[PDB]
Amino acid sequence: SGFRKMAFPSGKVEGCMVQVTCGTTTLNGLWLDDVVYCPRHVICTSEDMLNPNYEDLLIRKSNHNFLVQAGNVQLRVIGHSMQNCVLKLKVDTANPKTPKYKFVRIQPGQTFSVLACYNGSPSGVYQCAMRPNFTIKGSFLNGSCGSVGFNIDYDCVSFCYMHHMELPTGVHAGTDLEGNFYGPFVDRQTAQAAGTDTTITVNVLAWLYAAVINGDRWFLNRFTTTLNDFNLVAMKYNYEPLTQDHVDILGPLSAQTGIAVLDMCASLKELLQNGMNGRTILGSALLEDEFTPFDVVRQCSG
Amino acid sequence: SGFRKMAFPSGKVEGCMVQVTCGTTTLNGLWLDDVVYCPRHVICTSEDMLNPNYEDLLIRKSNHNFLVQAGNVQLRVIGHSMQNCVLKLKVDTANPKTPKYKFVRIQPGQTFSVLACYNGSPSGVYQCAMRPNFTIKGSFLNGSCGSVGFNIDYDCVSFCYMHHMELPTGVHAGTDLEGNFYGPFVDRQTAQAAGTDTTITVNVLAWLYAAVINGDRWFLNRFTTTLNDFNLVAMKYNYEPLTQDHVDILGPLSAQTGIAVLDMCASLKELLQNGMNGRTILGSALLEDEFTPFDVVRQCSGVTF
Numbered sequence: 001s002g003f004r005k006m007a008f009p010s011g012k013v014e015g016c017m018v019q020v021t022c023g024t025t026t027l028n029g030l031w032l033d034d035v036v037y038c039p040r041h042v043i044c045t046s047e048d049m050l051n052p053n054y055e056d057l058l059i060r061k062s063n064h065n066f067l068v069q070a071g072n073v074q075l076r077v078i079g080h081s082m083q084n085c086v087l088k089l090k091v092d093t094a095n096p097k098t099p100k101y102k103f104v105r106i107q108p109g110q111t112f113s114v115l116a117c118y119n120g121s122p123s124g125v126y127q128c129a130m131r132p133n134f135t136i137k138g139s140f141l142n143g144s145c146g147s148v149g150f151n152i153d154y155d156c157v158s159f160c161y162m163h164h165m166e167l168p169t170g171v172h173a174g175t176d177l178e179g180n181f182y183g184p185f186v187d188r189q190t191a192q193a194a195g196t197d198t199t200i201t202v203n204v205l206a207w208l209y210a211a212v213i214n215g216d217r218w219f220l221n222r223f224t225t226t227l228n229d230f231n232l233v234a235m236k237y238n239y240e241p242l243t244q245d246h247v248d249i250l251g252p253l254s255a256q257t258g259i260a261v262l263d264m265c266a267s268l269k270e271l272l273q274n275g276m277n278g279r280t281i282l283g284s285a286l287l288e289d290e291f292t293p294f295d296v297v298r299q300c301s302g
Numbered sequence: 303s304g305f306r307k308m309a310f311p312s313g314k315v316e317g318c319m320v321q322v323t324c325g326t327t328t329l330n331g332l333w334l335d336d337v338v339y340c341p342r343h344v345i346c347t348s349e350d351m352l353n354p355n356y357e358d359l360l361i362r363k364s365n366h367n368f369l370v371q372a373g374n375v376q377l378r379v380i381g382h383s384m385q386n387c388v389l390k391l392k393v394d395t396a397n398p399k400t401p402k403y404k405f406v407r408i409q410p411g412q413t414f415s416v417l418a419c420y421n422g423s424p425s426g427v428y429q430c431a432m433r434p435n436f437t438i439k440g441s442f443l444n445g446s447c448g449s450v451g452f453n454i455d456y457d458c459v460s461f462c463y464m465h466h467m468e469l470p471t472g473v474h475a476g477t478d479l480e481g482n483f484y485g486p487f488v489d490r491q492t493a494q495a496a497g498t499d500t501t502i503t504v505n506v507l508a509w510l511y512a513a514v515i516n517g518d519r520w521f522l523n524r525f526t527t528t529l530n531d532f533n534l535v536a537m538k539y540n541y542e543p544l545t546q547d548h549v550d551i552l553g554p555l556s557a558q559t560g561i562a563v564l565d566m567c568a569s570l571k572e573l574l575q576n577g578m579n580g581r582t583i584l585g586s587a588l589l590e591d592e593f594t595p596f597d598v599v600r601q602c603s604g605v606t607f
């Protein structure tokens with residue numbers, strides 16, 4: 001029993017974290033096989049960050065301008081190239097601690113673990129969700145760029161995020177491991193912001209199933225609803241529309257609890273329209289939307 | 303910016319997790335130097351676990367009854383001892399991945415990272431606090447016993463919890479690595495109630511400081527209270543008394559924000575008496591009490607390990 005914001009164990013990723021320096025700029029890189037991946041703005045200077053021409057800025061660099069430190073051992077760069085918004089530095093040694101891995105591009109509403117690092121050294125691990133507006137609500141300070149987000153399926157690490165920027169509102173933007181930003185953001189020190197965020201409906205429902213599994217049941221009612229009638233109330237409260245694919249994804253949780261998805265939707269509708277009345281669910285006075293159906297099964301199955 | 307429930311990196315601990323099997327019972331152990339630590343109830347059978355005499359149960363075992371698996375190598379048990387509620391299996395090989403470590407007994411209100419493990423394989427990491435009633439609000443399933451909790455300081459891992467039990471209310475009870483349970487709980491298959499809990503005041507204040515550092519300021523006010531007047535409200539709302547030691551511990555955060563502790567206390571008093579009026583603080587509609595002042599400093603200053 002119990003339900004926590006649970007990240008994946010971070011060791012397999014800790015073994016791949018390195019420090020990358022160019023000029024006076026230092027940030028984190030991800031060392032997999034004989035390649036180090038890092039944000040390309042490691043080649044910028046303070047004045048240049050406004051409208052940087054990365055093609056030219058990289059022309060002026062040689063392999064020896066890139067200092068890569070794994071612990072207190074220096075790796076020797078023997079090639080460099082740019083892929084979208086990430087730099088790839090080829091080094092002369094493969095990382096012995098390389099795990100089985102893949103690069104994936106995740107969809108809004110999906111979750112991942114972040115290993116926050118500074119100067120190639122890990123500082124902490126936490127769980128995030130790709131918001132519908134393609135930001136993440138992270139915890140990142142100066143020096144954290146190059147920190148990565150990941151999921152672990154068995155012993156395979158699926159890297160899905162590398163950190164680049166903090167938006168004016170305190171949320172965060174970055175790229176997949178092929179250097180493509182999530183959302184309409186660019187690696188420039190310019191006026192940027194995607195406001196107007198929405199709640200991830202299928203995640204709230206999964207979390208309500210988690211509550212039921214854990215014995216919190218006060219919000220269950222006898223009523224039911226249709227998908228169209230639920231979705232009318234949903235968009236009124238800034239919830240993502242619920243689709244049949246979402247309903248199907250919740251099949252396993254519905255089966256474990258005996259509660260059909262549309263019955264849960266009726267409970268959810270009443271919560272949105274009436275509040276919780278000074279009550280809590282799984283220790284929260286808000287409806288949580290950063291647990292996916294898989295996160296719930298993973299943590300209520302082990 | 304941003305403020306998350308942040309655990310320590312778990313790699314140093316992952317390297318110490320092993321599987322311990324005794325008969326049909328399998329659970330997790332902690333392999334440090336040439337000793338494997340695990341809950342002593344691994345030696346129980348379904349006909350014993352009610353009111354077991356653990357000394358008799360261990361006299362009746364031998365080294366070969368214990369089956370210890372470190373990844374894909376079998377460790378040879380060469381000795382066994384019991385200290386309080388923790389079993390100590392001496393093995394023939396020292397763990398090459400042993401970090402600098404300490405065994406520490408933590409105080410209610412102190413937080414730690416839990417590495418939830420099954421069959422000796424780490425499964426996830428999350429943050430917990432030792433509650434005032436000496437339970438922890440963990441996330442554990444069958445197979446999780448022997449999972450440990452810990453804090454890190456530079457390179458030293460301070461182990462403070464090993465998991466043994468879930469209470470009927472769904473919260474958890476365990477020992478320190480010296481084998482002494484937190485609270486009045488025992489390793490017997492009996493229902494033992496979590497007593498009434500209280501809110502960790504100093505941690506709530508630390509989290510309000512975290513909010514200020516991250517730009518949430520709406521709960522601040524022009525008032526300052528006295529410690530006495532604050533603690534009158536605290537008792538009524540089932541909050542721990544605030545002590546001068548707590549005020550001192552909050553020093554660094556009061557320094558960074560420029561907001562004195564007793565000034566912050568007047569915000570906490572107002573939130574307790576009037577609630578939050580449909581607003582949130584750091585994404586929460588409740589007052590969070592599982593971040594310590596060090597937790598705030600560590601996260602908002604980028605301390606690494």
Ligand SMILES: *[C@@H](CC(=O)OCC)[C@H](C[C@@H]1CCNC1=O)NC(=O)[C@H](Cc1ccccc1)NC(=O)[C@@H](Cc1ccccc1)NC(=O)CCOCC#C
Pocket residue numbers: 027041044049140141142143144145164165166167168169170172186187188189190191192303
């Ligand atoms: C990682 C690298 C770094 O520290 O280099 C700078 C010395 C950080 C992580 C950020 C830092 C604060 N919290 C984080 O998560 N990344 C940055 O600092 C990027 C660096 C960058 C270089 C070249 C081209 C693009 C980005 N910049 C930012 O994070 C800025 C982005 C910004 C600035 C002004 C308007 C919109 C967006 N964010 C920032 O300064 C905080 C929020 O902006 C407030 C304002 C105005």
Ligand SMILES: *[C@@H](CC(=O)OCC)[C@H](C[C@@H]1CCNC1=O)NC(=O)[C@H](Cc1ccccc1)NC(=O)[C@@H](Cc1ccccc1)NC(=O)CCOCC#C
Pocket residue numbers: 001327328329330343346351442443444445446447448466467468469470471474488489490491492493494
């Ligand atoms: C770890 C045991 C393990 O890994 O070994 C594998 C065989 C679990 C962790 C529990 C499991 C569910 N979630 C958890 O955190 N520990 C236990 O199962 C202990 C084992 C034990 C053996 C011998 C002596 C003491 C403890 N048992 C429990 O946790 C029971 C305690 C109990 C017994 C009788 C009535 C109430 C509580 N907890 C339990 O069953 C929780 C749900 O039932 C509540 C009721 C009623």
